[PDB]
Design a protein around this ligand. Structure first.
Ligand code: AKG
Ligand code: FE2
Length: 226
């Protein structure tokens, strides 16, 4: 009634850029609205019911690392149009930011990794997303879990910013967008989840680090949506 969305340019330049450059972590709640976030949840639940997910441990393994299942979504597939819209919304924010996030020049991204922690106390041990300079500079995560209560269901993303006297507890709440630097500045872990936990991750590529990267689906650079 009295509420209005912030335009992407404003959110980007007045909040995301300052917050990232000071803290290396930035949370945006109510990113897309209830209607759209509910539609994303249905599409992700469809992918799961219909059996499109692959054990994350298979992807990462050579010791148990991660209890999640996953699938990569390009954005344009049948029953994935709203994930496509999500990805375009993320892209619009980054475009407005680009130039002003450290000295990175972002020239692309991965496809969307839709991930599912199927309850049963599953999670992801402490890790750095990009420890060996594979080109990914920013991790962007969108959560879609209605009425999530970490007291009961756990599933917290805990981030340990390198050499800071602080840490961050990020709850995977419905319609929350999360940005953090993908490198060693931000080791993090998904703590045990006791309900079904959904999340959609995209990583953004720095043009320079990417070009110099040494010889997965994490390695494909798509152009940003217009
Ligand atoms: O779902 C999350 O909160 C983070 C998952 C994660 O860190 C990863 O899959 O690399
Ligand atoms: Fe991660």
């Amino acid at each position: 009634g009295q509420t209005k969305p912030l335009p992407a340019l404003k959110l980007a330049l007045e909040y995301i850029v300052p917050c990232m450059n000071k803290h290396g972590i930035c949370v945006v709640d109510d990113f897309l609205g209830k209607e759209t976030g509910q539609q994303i949840g249905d599409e992700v639940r469809a992918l799961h019911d219909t059996g499109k997910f692959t054990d994350g441990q298979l992807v990462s393994q050579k010791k148990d690392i991660r209890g999640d299942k996953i699938t990569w979504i390009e954005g344009k597939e049948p029953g994935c149009e709203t994930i496509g819209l999500l990805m375009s919304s993320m892209d619009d924010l980054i475009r407005h930011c680009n130039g002003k996030l450290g000295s990175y020049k972002i020239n692309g991204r991965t496809k969307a990794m839709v991930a599912c922690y199927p309850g049963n106390g599953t999670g992801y041990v402490r890790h750095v997303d990009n420890p060996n300079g594979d080109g990914r500079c920013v991790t962007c995560i969108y959560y879609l879990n209605k009425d999530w209560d970490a007291k009961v269901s756990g599933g917290i993303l805990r981030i340990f910013p390198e050499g800071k006297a602080q840490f961050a507890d990020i709850e995977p709440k419905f319609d929350r967008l999360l940005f953090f630097w993908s490198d060693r500045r931000n080791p993090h872990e998904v703590q045990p989840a006791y309900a079904t936990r959904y999340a959609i991750t995209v990583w953004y590529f720095d043009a320079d680090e990417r070009a110099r990267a040494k010889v997965g689906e994490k390695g494909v650079r798509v152009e940003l949506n217009k």
